[PDB]
């Protein structure tokens, strides 16, 4: 329905504070949410194309790991 707003204002505060930023102007939130959603969209679309090719309904940890290799933004520890 409307789930992009579920990335909460404190969660943005914390994630940006792990990233070390000092002052968050309140303008930041919706562009950060949209950017995140587009990165998810690319990874998910790729994972769905692997899953559709594999004749399979369930998206596995391997499909997201292969999408992260296809995008050159890899992630160790989930297998492979």
């Amino acid at each position: 329905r409307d789930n992009i707003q579920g990335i909460t204002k404190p969660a943005i505060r914390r994630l940006a504070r792990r990233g070390g930023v000092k002052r968050i102007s309140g303008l930041i939130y919706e562009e950060t949410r949209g950017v995140l959603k587009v990165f998810l969209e690319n990874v998910i679309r790729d994972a769905v194309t692997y899953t559709e090719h594999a004749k399979r309904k369930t998206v596995t940890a391997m499909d997201v790991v292969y999408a992260l290799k296809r995008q050159g933004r890899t992630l160790y520890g989930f297998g492979g």
Binding site: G6, T8, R18, G20, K22
Partner: protein, 93 residues
Amino acid sequence: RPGTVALREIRRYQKSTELLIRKLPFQRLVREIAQDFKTDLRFQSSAVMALQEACEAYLVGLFEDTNLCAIHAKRVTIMPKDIQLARRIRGER
């Protein structure tokens, strides 16, 4: 005082190891973004954890690059224009 507890907050999340986004909101967001690629998908419990680890990492790196943009412009205050600069010169879009 303000900006001092905002700075003291940095050292806690840079030392601590846990995920910062809420699992269920993220889990629904992945499924939402998937709906117009396909209906009726099943997601393995490990796959959405991997997607969250990738997304929090992507944002932490983008926030460092955002901090670089702001501090180069002599600001301790970040602005959406810092994200527009970064997402251009990254070569992404």
